[PDB]
Design a protein around this ligand. Structure first.
Ligand SMILES: Cc1cn([C@H]2C[C@H](O)[C@@H](COP(=O)(O)O)O2)c(=O)[nH]c1=O
Ligand SMILES: Cc1cn([C@H]2C[C@H](O)[C@@H](COP(=O)(O)O)O2)c(=O)[nH]c1=O
Ligand SMILES: [Mg+2]
Lengths: 196, 204
């Protein structure tokens, strides 16, 4: 089973990955985790990270350019993902393909049913071969709470809010597959039971 | 012996590659050729090509984004190149790193002294460890004639770089500066009527 944990910056994804992993383990299942972007493991990820901090000229000014970089980072992880899927009962990803759909659409002021979100699906799942997640878990957070709890994306308050809005719609519309929306207080045991 | 052939679109680089290949094989040296972008062998290359034709939204609007894709395409070729440099006396590349420096600078209205060319240097050679070419051969041709070739060899489609006559002229000018200053190593500037056999003896 492949599970992707999604959310805006400051959502608390790392902590949820930890709790959920612990719940599946207590339930008698092996669990492996992987986080994106894979900083320090792929040039694409590192260049994207640098671009978000002002490096590489006009690269970050392009929505599709940035999305392509994150997608190429994931492309180089296909072999790893397939390996984990063959060796573990549950593979939990901290950010996956939906991240690209949400942030790209938000930057273009588009919605979940927009062009960028559709493009992400056509490119990553079909052309790059990224496995579709069985479940995409959105750790939803309001803009106010997020704004409460420094690259180009992090500093852009408007972008974060719009990205949260796109995510909420990607989840409701079942983009890429089935979604579940949870809070940072979700009970690990019940969530794991629901995602079993 | 790593040899890279450079030049604007429609310069006739393919034709020169062949001639140089045969000439080298005559002198008793084995040769392998590889062209960039590696269409069909790299997703980075295929997306770059489609982007040059208007696909993928605003991708092509970013000069550095396009340079990066071509740079990533080559990075995924580092092992294939090293390999060739192992199984053949001479390796001839149709376009290489200098192509990125020339077009990027040209798109930004910069020259060999601009940030873009220096950027391509750091990223491709200093960071991605792409093998420095022994020789970079600039096939200098008439801008009018090169543009006509592209138009003809397609109208019988042209991408965004090919249809930009001013871009092609500037790219030709940047190339001359790169060759003149020995950017990335030693260069050799030749014409369309260059004698194959003589060129080979010169290079090797
Ligand atoms: C993995 C991924 C991240 N991003 C973003 C969201 C973050 O602001 C930034 C780096 O992610 P991070 O904060 O989880 O390390 O890049 C995308 O836009 N698309 C993607 O596919
Ligand atoms: C290989 C390469 C090509 N280009 C260009 C020049 C061409 O107009 C276009 C596609 O190359 P092509 O005419 O050899 O098929 O992309 C770059 O800008 N950087 C590169 O590194
Ligand atoms: Mg061409």
């Amino acid at each position: 089973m492949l599970i992707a944990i999604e959310g805006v910056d400051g959502a608390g994804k790392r902590t949820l990955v930890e709790k959920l992993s612990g719940a599946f383990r207590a339930a008698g299942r092996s669990v492996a985790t992987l986080a994106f972007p894979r900083y320090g493991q792929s040039v694409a990820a590192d260049i994207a990270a640098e671009a978000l901090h002002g490096e590489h000229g006009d690269l970050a000014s392009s929505v599709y350019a940035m999305a392509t970089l994150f997608a190429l980072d994931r492309a180089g992880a296909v072999h790893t993902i397939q390996g984990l899927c063959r060796g573990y009962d549950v593979v939990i990803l901290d950010r996956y393909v939906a991240s690209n759909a949400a942030y790209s659409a938000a930057r273009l002021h588009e919605n979940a049913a927009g062009k960028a979100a559709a493009w992400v699906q056509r490119i990553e799942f079909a052309r790059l071969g990224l496995p579709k997640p069985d479940w995409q878990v959105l750790l939803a957070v309001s803009a106010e709470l997020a704004g409460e709890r420094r690259d180009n994306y992090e500093r852009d308050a408007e972008l974060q809010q719009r990205t949260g809005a796109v995510y909420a719609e990607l989840a409701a519309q079942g983009w890429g597959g089935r979604w579940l929306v949870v809070g940072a207080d979700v009970d690990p045991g019940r969530l794991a039971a629901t995602l079993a």
